[PDB]
């Protein structure tokens, strides 16, 4: 059912020590090779008062 390429869309509502935000992502990945890439835009809440690193594993 799934192949050498696949598309990615992402919607994250989140919140960190007060600040609410929304992030939307588009990208693709190689499921069978174990990789992917994602362009990430901050809809609501920009600019982030906190390290973006905490987010990345959720995206």
């Amino acid at each position: 059912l799934i192949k050498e390429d696949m598309r990615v869309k992402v919607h994250m509502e989140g919140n960190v020590n007060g600040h609410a935000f929304v992030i939307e992502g588009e990208g693709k990945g190689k499921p069978y090779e174990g990789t992917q890439t994602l362009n990430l835009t901050v809809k609501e809440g920009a600019p982030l008062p906190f390290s973006y690193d905490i987010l990345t594993t959720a995206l």
């Binding site: 799934i2 960190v16 973006y52 905490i54």
Partner: protein, 165 residues
């Protein structure tokens, strides 16, 4: 998305199996300086495009820390340990944020992956990962994200052989 993980025939793949229905996972991230995040994400497949709806709720980070002070660097590569528990796959990791200057900032990561379907279940295994920001704008309103993840057993062969417990 652990769908995007390489899995040899040796090991069942919990994530590509789950589909067509797909899966859900829950993660807690517990930091070296006592911050915390819980996260939930639903992963579905409609067509060729995985949709990932997520709810990230981070909390309790001290106000003058490397997170709130916006001064971390990246994640280190990592290796997840993964066992079955209550018939779910559970993902355990020791994570490390490099700190601007030299030092680290640290994080246990525990995940419960839950496939909306019965699938063939794996034994204990690892995933080795690497997540990276490849580009961004000034305030990371725009970011470009690269993970890589590959599943294995231990490379160190077993030399025990024949025994009674």
């Amino acid at each position: 998305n652990r769908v995007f993980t390489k899995y040899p025939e040796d090991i069942p793949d919990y994530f590509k199996q789950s589909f067509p229905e797909g899966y859900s996972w829950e993660r807690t991230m517990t930091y070296e300086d006592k911050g915390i995040c819980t996260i939930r994400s639903d992963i579905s497949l409609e067509g060729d495009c995985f949709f990932q709806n997520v709810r990230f709720n981070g909390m309790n980070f001290p106000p003058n820390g490397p997170v709130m002070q916006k001064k971390t660097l990246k994640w280190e590569p990592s290796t997840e340990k993964l066992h079955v528990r209550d018939g779910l796959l559970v993902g355990n990791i020791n994570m490390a944020l490099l700190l601007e200057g030299g030092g680290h900032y640290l994080c246990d990561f525990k995940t419960t992956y839950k496939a909306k379907k019965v699938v063939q279940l794996p034994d204990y295994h690892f995933v080795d990962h690497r997540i990276e920001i490849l580009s961004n704008d000034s305030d990371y309103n725009k970011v470009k994200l690269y993970e890589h993840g590959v599943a294995r057993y231990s490379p160190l062969p077993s030399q025990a052989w024949g025994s009674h417990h």
